[PDB]
Every structure is written in C-alpha cells, then in structure tokens.
C-alpha cells in the first residue's frame, strides 16, 4: 500500500483576529461608562477595534472583540488593568 502523504504548508492566516476575555459584568459597565468614553477613547487610541459588552440580563460575563492583533493585544491589556482597577477596596494592587 501507499499513503500518498505529503510535507507542504498553507499560508492559512486571517486579516481579523476575534479575542475574548474574562470579566464580570459589574465591571463591564464600569469600563463602558456613561457615554462609552471609556471604551471609545481606548479604540481609536488603540487604532479602532470594536468591543462587544454582554447584557447584565442575559448573564454572560463574557467579552468579545474584533480587529487588528496588533492592536487587540493592546485593548485586552487596557481593559483587564482598568476593569481589575476600578474595583475599589483596600489594599490597592500595582501593575
């Protein structure tokens, strides 16, 4: 017999990469705001993704964003600093 393999690659990449994280929804308003200041400032800064925030009624502490690796990298790191920031308690931590 004969499995007629090969060793050859693709160039199988994406233009648009979709990254998700972890934050609770207490939080979530918190970094949109109450004029999505907060969140619009951080898109363009960034270069212009956009961020997709769960409605408390459903229940879904989930986030999903869109753009650019590059730049998604940097409104991830953003918004895990901030969201983990305005939680207000004693005992602050750097970063």
Same mark, same amino acid.
């Given at each position: 017999? =004969? =499995?007629?393999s090969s060793g050859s690659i693709q160039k199988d990449l994406? $233009?648009?990469?979709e990254v998700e994280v972890s934050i609770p929804a207490?939080?979530? $308003?918190? +970094?949109?705001?109450?004029?999505?200041? +907060?969140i619009r400032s951080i898109m363009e800064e960034c270069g212009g993704v956009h961020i997709h925030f769960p409605v408390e009624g459903s229940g879904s502490d989930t986030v999903v964003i869109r753009g650019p690796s590059s730049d998604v990298e940097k409104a991830k790191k953003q918004l895990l600093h901030l969201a983990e920031e305005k939680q207000t308690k004693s005992g602050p931590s750097s970063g």
């Open positions: 017999g =004969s =499995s007629g994406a $233009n648009i990469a207490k939080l979530h $308003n918190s +970094l949109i705001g109450t004029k999505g200041r +907060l």
